[PDB]
Amino acid sequence: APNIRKSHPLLKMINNSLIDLPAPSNISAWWNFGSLLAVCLMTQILTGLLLAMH
Amino acid sequence: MAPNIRKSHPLLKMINNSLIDLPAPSNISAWWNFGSLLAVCLMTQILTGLLLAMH
Amino acid sequence: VHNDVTVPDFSAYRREDVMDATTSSQTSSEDRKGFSYLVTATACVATAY
Amino acid sequence: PGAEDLEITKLPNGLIIASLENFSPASRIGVFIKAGSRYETTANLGTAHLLRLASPLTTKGASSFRITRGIEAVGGSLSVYSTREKMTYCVECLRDHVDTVMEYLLNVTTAPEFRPWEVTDLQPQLKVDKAVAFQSPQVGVLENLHAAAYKTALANPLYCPDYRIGKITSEQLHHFVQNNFTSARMALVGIGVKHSDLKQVAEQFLNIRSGAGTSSAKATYWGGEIREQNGHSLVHAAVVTEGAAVGSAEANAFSVLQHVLGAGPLIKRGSSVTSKLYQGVAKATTQPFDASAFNVNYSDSGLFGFYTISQAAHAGEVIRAAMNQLKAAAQGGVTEEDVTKAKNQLKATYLMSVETAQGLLNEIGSEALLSGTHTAPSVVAQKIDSVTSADVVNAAKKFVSGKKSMAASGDLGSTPFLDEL
Amino acid sequence: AEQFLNIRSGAGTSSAKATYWGGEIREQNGHSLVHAAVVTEGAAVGSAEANAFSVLQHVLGAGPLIKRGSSVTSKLYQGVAKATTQPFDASAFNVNYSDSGLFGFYTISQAAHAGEVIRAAMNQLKAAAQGGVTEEDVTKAKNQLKATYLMSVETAQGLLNEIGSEALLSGTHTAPSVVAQKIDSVTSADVVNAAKKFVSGKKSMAASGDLGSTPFLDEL
Amino acid sequence: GRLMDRIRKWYYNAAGFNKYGLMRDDTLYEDDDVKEALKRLPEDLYNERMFRIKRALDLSLKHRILPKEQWVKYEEDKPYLEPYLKEVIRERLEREAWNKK
Amino acid sequence: XXXXXXXXXXXXXXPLLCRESMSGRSARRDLVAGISLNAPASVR
Amino acid sequence: XXXXXXXXXXXPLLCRESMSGRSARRDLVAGISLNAPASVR
Amino acid sequence: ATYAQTLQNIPETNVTTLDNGLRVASEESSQPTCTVGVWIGAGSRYENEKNNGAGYFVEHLAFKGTKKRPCAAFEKEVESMGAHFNGYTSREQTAFYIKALSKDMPKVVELLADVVQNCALEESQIEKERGVILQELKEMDNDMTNVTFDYLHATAFQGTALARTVEGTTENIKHLTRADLASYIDTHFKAPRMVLAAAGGISHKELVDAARQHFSGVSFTYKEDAVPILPRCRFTGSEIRARDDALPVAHVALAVEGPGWADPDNVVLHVANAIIGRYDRTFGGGKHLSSRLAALAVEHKLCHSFQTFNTSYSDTGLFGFHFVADPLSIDDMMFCAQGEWMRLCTSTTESEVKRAKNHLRSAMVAQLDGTTPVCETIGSHLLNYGRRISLEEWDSRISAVDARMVRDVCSKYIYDKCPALAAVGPIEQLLDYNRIRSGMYWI
Numbered sequence A: 001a002p003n004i005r006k007s008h009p010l011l012k013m014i015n016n017s018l019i020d021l022p023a024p025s026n027i028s029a030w031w032n033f034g035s036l037l038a039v040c041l042m043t044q045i046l047t048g049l050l051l052a053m054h
Numbered sequence B: 001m002a003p004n005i006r007k008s009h010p011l012l013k014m015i016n017n018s019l020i021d022l023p024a025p026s027n028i029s030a031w032w033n034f035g036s037l038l039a040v041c042l043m044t045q046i047l048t049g050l051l052l053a054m055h
Numbered sequence C: 001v002h003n004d005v006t007v008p009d010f011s012a013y014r015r016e017d018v019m020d021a022t023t024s025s026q027t028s029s030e031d032r033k034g035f036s037y038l039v040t041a042t043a044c045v046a047t048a049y
Numbered sequence D: 001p002g003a004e005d006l007e008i009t010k011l012p013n014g015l016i017i018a019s020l021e022n023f024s025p026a027s028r029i030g031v032f033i034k035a036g037s038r039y040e041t042t043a044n045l046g047t048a049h050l051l052r053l054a055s056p057l058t059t060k061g062a063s064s065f066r067i068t069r070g071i072e073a074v075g076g077s078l079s080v081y082s083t084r085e086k087m088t089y090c091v092e093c094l095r096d097h098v099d100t101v102m103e104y105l106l107n108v109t110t111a112p113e114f115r116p117w118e119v120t121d122l123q124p125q126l127k128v129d130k131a132v133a134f135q136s137p138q139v140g141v142l143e144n145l146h147a148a149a150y151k152t153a154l155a156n157p158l159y160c161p162d163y164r165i166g167k168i169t170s171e172q173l174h175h176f177v178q179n180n181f182t183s184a185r186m187a188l189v190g191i192g193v194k195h196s197d198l199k200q201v202a203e204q205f206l207n208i209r210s211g212a213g214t215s216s217a218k219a220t221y222w223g224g225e226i227r228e229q230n231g232h233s234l235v236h237a238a239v240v241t242e243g244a245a246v247g248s249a250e251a252n253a254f255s256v257l258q259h260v261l262g263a264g265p266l267i268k269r270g271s272s273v274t275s276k277l278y279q280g281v282a283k284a285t286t287q288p289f290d291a292s293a294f295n296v297n298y299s300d301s302g303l304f305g306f307y308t309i310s311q312a313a314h315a316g317e318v319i320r321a322a323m324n325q326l327k328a329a330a331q332g333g334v335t336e337e338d339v340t341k342a343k344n345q346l347k348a349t350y351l352m353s354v355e356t357a358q359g360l361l362n363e364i365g366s367e368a369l370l371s372g373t374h375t376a377p378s379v380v381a382q383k384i385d386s387v388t389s390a391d392v393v394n395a396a397k398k399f400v401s402g403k404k405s406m407a408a409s410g411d412l413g414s415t416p417f418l419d420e421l
Numbered sequence E: 001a002e003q004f005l006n007i008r009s010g011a012g013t014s015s016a017k018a019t020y021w022g023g024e025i026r027e028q029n030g031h032s033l034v035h036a037a038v039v040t041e042g043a044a045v046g047s048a049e050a051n052a053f054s055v056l057q058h059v060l061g062a063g064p065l066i067k068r069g070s071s072v073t074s075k076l077y078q079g080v081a082k083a084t085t086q087p088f089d090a091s092a093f094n095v096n097y098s099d100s101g102l103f104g105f106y107t108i109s110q111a112a113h114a115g116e117v118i119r120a121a122m123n124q125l126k127a128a129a130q131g132g133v134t135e136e137d138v139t140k141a142k143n144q145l146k147a148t149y150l151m152s153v154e155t156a157q158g159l160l161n162e163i164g165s166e167a168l169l170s171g172t173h174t175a176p177s178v179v180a181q182k183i184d185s186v187t188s189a190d191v192v193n194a195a196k197k198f199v200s201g202k203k204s205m206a207a208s209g210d211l212g213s214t215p216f217l218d219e220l
Numbered sequence F: 001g002r003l004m005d006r007i008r009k010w011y012y013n014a015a016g017f018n019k020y021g022l023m024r025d026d027t028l029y030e031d032d033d034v035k036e037a038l039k040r041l042p043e044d045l046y047n048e049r050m051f052r053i054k055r056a057l058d059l060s061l062k063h064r065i066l067p068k069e070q071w072v073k074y075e076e077d078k079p080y081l082e083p084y085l086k087e088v089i090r091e092r093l094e095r096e097a098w099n100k101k
Numbered sequence G: 001x002x003x004x005x006x007x008x009x010x011x012x013x014x015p016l017l018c019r020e021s022m023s024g025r026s027a028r029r030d031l032v033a034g035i036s037l038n039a040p041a042s043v044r
Numbered sequence H: 001x002x003x004x005x006x007x008x009x010x011x012p013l014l015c016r017e018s019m020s021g022r023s024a025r026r027d028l029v030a031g032i033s034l035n036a037p038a039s040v041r
Numbered sequence I: 001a002t003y004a005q006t007l008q009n010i011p012e013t014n015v016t017t018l019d020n021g022l023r024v025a026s027e028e029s030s031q032p033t034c035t036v037g038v039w040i041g042a043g044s045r046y047e048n049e050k051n052n053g054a055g056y057f058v059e060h061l062a063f064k065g066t067k068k069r070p071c072a073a074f075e076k077e078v079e080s081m082g083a084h085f086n087g088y089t090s091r092e093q094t095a096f097y098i099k100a101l102s103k104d105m106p107k108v109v110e111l112l113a114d115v116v117q118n119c120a121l122e123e124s125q126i127e128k129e130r131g132v133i134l135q136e137l138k139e140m141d142n143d144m145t146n147v148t149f150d151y152l153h154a155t156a157f158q159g160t161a162l163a164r165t166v167e168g169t170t171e172n173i174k175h176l177t178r179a180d181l182a183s184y185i186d187t188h189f190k191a192p193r194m195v196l197a198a199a200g201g202i203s204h205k206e207l208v209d210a211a212r213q214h215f216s217g218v219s220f221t222y223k224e225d226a227v228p229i230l231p232r233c234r235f236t237g238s239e240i241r242a243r244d245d246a247l248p249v250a251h252v253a254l255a256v257e258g259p260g261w262a263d264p265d266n267v268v269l270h271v272a273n274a275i276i277g278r279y280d281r282t283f284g285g286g287k288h289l290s291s292r293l294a295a296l297a298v299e300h301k302l303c304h305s306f307q308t309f310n311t312s313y314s315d316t317g318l319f320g321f322h323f324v325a326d327p328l329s330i331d332d333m334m335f336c337a338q339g340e341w342m343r344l345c346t347s348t349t350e351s352e353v354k355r356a357k358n359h360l361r362s363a364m365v366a367q368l369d370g371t372t373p374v375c376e377t378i379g380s381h382l383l384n385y386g387r388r389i390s391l392e393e394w395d396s397r398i399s400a401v402d403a404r405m406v407r408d409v410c411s412k413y414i415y416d417k418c419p420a421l422a423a424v425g426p427i428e429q430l431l432d433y434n435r436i437r438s439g440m441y442w443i
């Protein structure tokens, strides 16, 4: 395995999910809300932690 | 496809390839036990901790 | 060849009832399995408790 | 009770119906057809091979599923045996489920569909079926023998050539069945069945065109020398000239000469005393070997000679010795007792071969196909021992005189060429 | 070569001198084009009849000298062209080994027209042996040959090989003027003689293609 | 009936996959049956289906459609896969029935 | 219903070295070729 | 240091002149090179 | 005329016994040819530590001439009458038989009686068969199916007589003496333990007459009359793994202990074995085969071949299966195979056995296609059952088999039993007896 993006067992599911992952060419903006929910979850957890510390 | 649904099921697969069909050396000793101990101990601490945190 | 191959003697590890080679191994099968499964079944009970 | 004789009916089609009730609890019906690779040309090589593998494929009356499931449902079996110029479609089952298995048999031979995707999926089986048959070194030289002996028809290989695997069209299968599976080229031969039923079936269901359809360019002789170097410690070798055809009076003479020279040991792990060929070579070589008499009889031709399985460096010794035995046999070295002893061994071999269900159905259907009759076993016993001692020495003369063709595969480092015999 | 290169001296393992056979190897592979070669025993390297065959080669013709061009000098190319309709190639084949050699023709033709080309190519050597060789044809071939030799030694590969080939066998190099002498000192009779040896000698044939219409060796 | 037959032509236009240059059988959801039927398709029909789909996909990401001229007419729609699909289903129903015996 | 099965590796293809356990096989006829619905393929 | 390569596996030219120059002038040389595509004549 | 009547209309097998205890049985037909030989109750189980493979060494010297007629004469005489002389030896059964014309029957019986009794055992001839057997050993050693089944016995009946190969050790073949061979023949080839069977165009009375003449004098003591009661063989839930990764394909055999010839359950076990059946990549039926294991074998490319067997012996047997597969398809193949075993004990439907019975019916009938296979059945039926079991009787036993019975019999011999495992070749994917052992319960 040439590069260390297809090799590295950590970077490889990083690669096969957010880099080289085959996606349909014609999915619309209705397919955006998946990644929105993901970021929104990480946002809620962070803002929640900051609130919980008080 | 694949015959059984233990090698197929993407959930049961890494359950299989970690705790069932996973190849291990035939001669590892009791010094190799403390890995799974730490694992259970972690799940134990989290559970007992949650129960304490609720009060 | 393969004809020159035989199974070693396991009498050092065999149970009591399968020790004799001219004796049926099956008459004492339920007896041997029933004990080990009893140990298991008990451990299940102790765990369940 | 009792055992009543065999019946034969020649339908208006030209179709032969040879039946025989033996009251055996197992029936065995076959469809003998004059097909095979003999009728292939360079355009459709291997279409005869793929054809016999195409038996379980879908038909116009039964799915590829129902064919296999329906036959197995009654303990029955379906198989297709075929030589270079013959094709038999056999079914075995209990006496009860004849009509059941008879349907699928009739559907396969008279109404295949050869669906393009099923044909395509079947193509790679040619690789497999050929690979397992070619595991025996004999089929190697035996296919190369026919290639070196003839120029066409019989020169065509029995198993499909590699370069045409996956390249046989679904239409070529259709055309081959349409051109060769015609009524005047077939025979519905049965065993453990009443003739009135087997006749009723052949009339109530066989419709594919009458006549003779596509014919075959008669086998032109060549006389070639095909040699395969593959480093195997054992060297197979065959040396033949043009033998005799089926039905020929000259045919019986060769079969007797075969047993005079000797054809395969009759005693387990035993030396062959009657065999002048086995013995004659044994005097020449030291090590284990095998040397038998080779004789084929086709419709328009035939091959006769010897086949020697020997060790690598001792191939030369065995082959030359085996050659001398036919020279000495042609120079007169044939006792009047040797003939009668061979005529005895031959009458035996024939009789016990027809013990089996396979042997009986084949022997009946073979003759019923060609010369639409069945010869009484007593008269076939007459036609054989009515062969003189001179007829045998004459057959040997034809070998030493005629142009030879040789096929040999092995480590041919010490295997003699054909112009060295 | 001396203060570095040594190891085992002498002549070492020798070779069993080439016994002739005269066989017929045929490969059926369904290719639309059928290759075919028909040869008899030619002349060895440094033979007397060596130069005679090389001249006969150019008389019959060996590969077009003009890009996308028909071959006029080639009696083989032309003789076949009269027999067949479709595109093809038919050249003169000549090898010279140490103790033997091969000479004949090589025909690349279409499948069904293989028979036409092969038979025609055969007749050209028959007619060449029956006298059909002009004194000019020889001189024209002896010219084509002296040319081919000379421009082959232009390259570094050709020069090193030509020098080393002779230096290996007969430990000398022959002056290019004398090799030009030895070639055109070949008579017209020598050429017709070489053709005679082909039609007489035992032939061996190799052909691979869709040999459905490719003739056997006992049909020529 | 011809009343239901006219309703057909209305739905075909209301569906509007012809605007993408797609046949009716192009829009078929590929379950286990359709997948099998597709593998039985001749090379030419398969390679043509592949282009029509890839064209519809390319159009969809462009948020454009084909010119009105290039729209598949209702009467010009080829049911190229339906005969294959019917046999695939027929064969399967046989096995399912034969296995309950 | 009878007959013994086999299998070899392909691509290159994938009990015959005695005087007796190799014997019984030296071509008496020519070459028959069998294939079956449920029985191993045979050859003579 | 010169010459063109190729690629095939295991396991057209149909006009009189674009497939001309082949019929074996001599016979058959076999070349292989440390850094140059395997020659064949 | 149908099947149910053509079974009762089969000519019954006649049985008569001489003074010395030798039984004579015949199936008379209208055959111009016939098969007649002697089936002896002798094999490698009757052998032991020092005379192992002696009966096989004897089998080599049976056709090599007798006292009355040496090698040259004996071979010449047998060949001349167009007669074929053949025989074998198993673990529990030796046989020598002849195929000839029905007219030569009395001469044949004389020829048979000569070999079993007045065998030559030439001291010079023995030395040649030394290298002959030693070559047949090297030859059979490349038969992976052969090596596996020998290994199966070697571990299933480990520590007993049945664990030995029929051919014997290399050391034994090396050092066996003429005395040792002659001892085996005298000790085992005795009249009461022999059966003269025949089948063809043979009059039974004429048979027992020629038999009465050449099968000889009465035994004197009681010892020479009595038939020996072999010591029992112990089954062992065990495994033997002979690993060779250079070997192209792997062989695996797995078996439980059988019931023995006497047990009527052996019929049901054959019905059950018919359900799973067998396969190899030349089975044209393909994915549509009725056998579930065969269908899964095709769908997932599990193996090159698989077979089920119920090898029965006198007091025991071996119910199991054997398959040949690629190095990476073994585990999935073994998985499915053991699954179908559980499916036998648990889920077997009437529809399945209705087919299996029809196959077994067609099988036993196909077993009797010719004179030799009839003679083989007869020579074995007497030697194992004490009588001939007509196809009519077999059908009655088989036709009484139903799904509820197959489940019970299989659950009795298979379920939660410690099996015997023989594995040869590239065998990494298949591993751990404990995993195999756990595959013996719960479908």
Ligand code: HEM
Pocket (backbone or CB within 6 Å): A041, A044, A045, A046, A047, A048, A049, A051, A052, A053
């Ligand atoms: C999906 C993730 C989450 C959701 C949907 C969520 C939702 C909410 C909501 C609706 C409230 C009510 C606040 C209001 O309306 O006034 C709240 C309050 C709160 N949450 Fe979360 N929360 C999430 C994650 C977290 C996490 C991860 C933490 C801590 C680790 C956290 C800690 C708190 C705290 C401390 C409050 C009280 C502050 C307040 O009431 O505004 N939250 N959350």
Ligand code: HEM
Pocket (backbone or CB within 6 Å): B042, B045, B046, B047, B048, B049, B050, B052, B053, B054
């Ligand atoms: C690896 C995991 C954990 C470790 C090592 C750990 C360790 C500890 C320790 C050393 C104490 C001190 C208690 C004492 O000595 O009196 C404590 C207290 C406590 N922990 Fe954890 N803990 C873990 C997980 C958790 C989790 C997951 C939670 C809640 C979700 C939790 C909640 C609490 C609470 C509420 C207390 C106060 C109760 C007490 O002081 O006894 N713990 N923990």
